[PDB]
Amino acid sequence: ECRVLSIQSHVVRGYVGNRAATFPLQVLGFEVDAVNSVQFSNHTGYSHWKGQVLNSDELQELYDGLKLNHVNQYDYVLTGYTRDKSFLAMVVDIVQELKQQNPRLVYVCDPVMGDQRNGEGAMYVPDDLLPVYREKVVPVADIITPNQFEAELLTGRKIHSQEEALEVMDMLHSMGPDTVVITSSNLLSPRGSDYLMALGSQRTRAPDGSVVTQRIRMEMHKVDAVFVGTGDLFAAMLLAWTHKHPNNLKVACEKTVSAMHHVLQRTIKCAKAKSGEGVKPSPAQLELRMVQSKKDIESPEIVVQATVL
Numbered sequence: 023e024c025r026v027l028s029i030q031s032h033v034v035r036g037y038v039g040n041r042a043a044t045f046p047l048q049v050l051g052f053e054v055d056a057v058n059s060v061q062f063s064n065h066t067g068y069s070h071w072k073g074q075v076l077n078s079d080e081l082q083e084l085y086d087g088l089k090l091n092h093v094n095q096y097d098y099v100l101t102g103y104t105r106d107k108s109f110l111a112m113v114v115d116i117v118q119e120l121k122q123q124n125p126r127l128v129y130v131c132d133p134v135m136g137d138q139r140n141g142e143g144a145m146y147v148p149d150d151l152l153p154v155y156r157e158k159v160v161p162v163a164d165i166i167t168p169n170q171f172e173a174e175l176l177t178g179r180k181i182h183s184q185e186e187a188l189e190v191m192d193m194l195h196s197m198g199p200d201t202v203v204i205t206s207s208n209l210l211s212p213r214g215s216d217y218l219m220a221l222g223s224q225r226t227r228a229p230d231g232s233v234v235t236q237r238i239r240m241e242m243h244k245v246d247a248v249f250v251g252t253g254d255l256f257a258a259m260l261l262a263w264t265h266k267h268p269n270n271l272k273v274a275c276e277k278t279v280s281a282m283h284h285v286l287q288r289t290i291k292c293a294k295a296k297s298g299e300g301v302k303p304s305p306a307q308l309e310l311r312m313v314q315s316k317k318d319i320e321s322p323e324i325v326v327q328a329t330v331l
């Protein structure tokens with residue numbers, strides 16, 4: 023389709039934020055407009071890093087710039103990782119106005135707060151953004167893609183099983199999103215810890231008989247290491263697919279997830295090819311071979327399966 027306004031980080035080297043969401047959304051042909059929330063030499067997982075960040079007024083400035091020219095009409099809107107309470111507030115205001123300009127304006131929001139290894143408490147962002155995502159952000163998004171950990175901070179409920187997972191999504195939907203996709207979880211699955219499971223559900227409509235929800239469950243094949251930027255590349259590719267497949271939360275994750283295995287085992291492939299068998303690949307070597315996946319980002323050779331409910 024077309025016009026995406028993506029507000030995310032930018033790194034000179036590597037793939038994270040806009041660097042991870044642009045090329046994709048581009049070769050799949052979207053007119054991606056990018057607002058760089060920060061500009062760092064590289065992501066903060068490298069030993070060193072240097073750069074500047076955009077404050078709230080600077081973001082404001084760029085947005086004014088677009089109003090004045092009346093070119094501020096967008097179809098879908100994308101956002102991810104932020105550290106600033108205020109930058110996230112502003113971002114909310116901006117997404118509001120853009121929905122009047124275009125009624126079918128879907129705000130796709132990956133609520134990046136932190137991570138899980140196995141049941142817990144603190145995350146990656148200060149704890150003071152938690153409220154903003156819950157009270158202000160999530161009520162306006164139309165597609166969110168949280169961790170199991172994050173889905174729990176949002177709903178404030180701990181996920182212990184599968185159907186406890188499904189009822190944390192429902193408290194999600196009701197929050198606003200006619201789509202929720204738990205990109206990853208601690209939940210063992212019908213296939214072994216070798217794998218990794220994610221969850222998906224989409225609250226739809228038909229006049230009365232006013233209720234439809236759809237659920238599924240992909241299990242893609244875990245990979246031995248620490249990548250950074252995977253969730254940006256995920257949410258980016260979701261949008262694409264969930265673009266073509268408006269009532270098919272099923273059909274979507276399916277191609278997205280599929281593309282994800284290629285990109286990573288090519289990354290992992292080259293990744294080790296730079297220590298072969300012998301030592302751990304450095305942050306540098308793990309960076310996504312997004313370019314080389316020129317060909318797969320493109321054509322998901324559908325390698326995964328999923329069960330409705």
Ligand SMILES: CC[C@H](CO)Nc1nc(NCc2ccccc2)c2ncn(C(C)C)c2n1
Nearest residue numbers: 031038039060065066067103105134146251
């Ligand atoms: C904080 C987690 C990670 C550390 O391994 N580093 C990092 N660093 C990033 N660099 C940009 C940045 C630096 C400082 C503050 C805010 C953003 C970054 N951008 C998007 N993402 C993630 C959510 C995919 C980013 N992640």
